[PDB]
Copies of this chain bind each other. A is one copy, B any other.
Amino acid sequence: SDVFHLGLTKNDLQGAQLAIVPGDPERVEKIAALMDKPVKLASHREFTSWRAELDGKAVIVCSTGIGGPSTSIAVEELAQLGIRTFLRIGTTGAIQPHINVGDVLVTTASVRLDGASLHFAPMEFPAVADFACTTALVEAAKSIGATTHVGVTASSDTFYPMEEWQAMGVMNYEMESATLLTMCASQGLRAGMVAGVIVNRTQTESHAVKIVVEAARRLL
């Protein structure tokens, strides 16, 4: 009602200033289930949103869809509704031999191989994560005894179609973080990014979900 795509009003958010933004609706419900007073708000196209409460404060969980373009819509419209901190959780493969399936990756910054990040800042600007959010993710991962790696993620527009990134120390590949981190860092919004390792070519997801919620708690 207040926004073009999400089908939400400011009032729906009950003062929420933080959102957790996974890609998929099934993951949204799982995340909200970990919190208090979970309520489904809306479901339009790729954007399924729930509301919940952490330490007496409202938090929103909203799916992004696939890629920077849909992610860009979700984040902008949530910011219009008052959210100032965004935490993404995903699941990925790793490209480094020492990263084990079951490990947790906290992204400090992303390689900008997407198209949407350029709609926010020129290529020379860093797709960097917020320091508070990065710290909270690392703390919450240690809190549940997760094995954690912290570093750079490669972010692109294609799922499928060179070992330069490995030689440069890149941890993993995904499709959304470049847009998310760039759009937030260049517009006065805080953003964090965490992922669970589900596969590694050189070689247990509920953890990342718990970690993102517990991180959110430290940021309220």
Q: Which residues on A are within 8 Å of B, measured CB to CB? A: 4-5, 23-26, 45-46, 65-70, 72-73, 76, 106, 108-116, 118-121, 123-129, 131, 134-135, 138, 150-152, 156-161, 168-169, 175, 185-188
Contact = CB atoms under 8 A, between A and B. Distances in A.
A119 B161 contact: yes
B112 A124 contact: yes
Given A65-B67, A108-B108, A119-B157, 6 more contacts: A5-B159, A68-B115, A110-B126, A111-B125, A115-B115, A125-B168
A210 to B, nearest CB: 21
A157 B126 contact: no
Contacts of A185: 152, 168-169
6 contacts: A65-B66, A69-B158, A115-B118, A119-B160, A152-B185, A168-B187
A119 B76 contact: no
A26 B46 CA distance: 11
**Lowest 8 CB-CB distances: which A-B pairs, in order?**
A115-B115, A67-B69, A109-B126, A109-B128, A116-B157, A115-B157, A168-B186, A119-B158
A31 to B, nearest CB: 16
Contacts of A150: 131
B157 A169 contact: no
A69 B68 contact: yes
Contacts of A168: 121, 125, 185-187
A124 B125 contact: no
A106 B124 CA distance: 19
Contact of A46 (B46, B106, B126, B128): B46
Contacts of A188: 169
Contacts of A106: 131
Contact of A158 (B116, B157, B169): B116
B115 A116 contact: yes
Nearest to A176: B69
Nearest to A186: B168
A28 B168 CA distance: 30
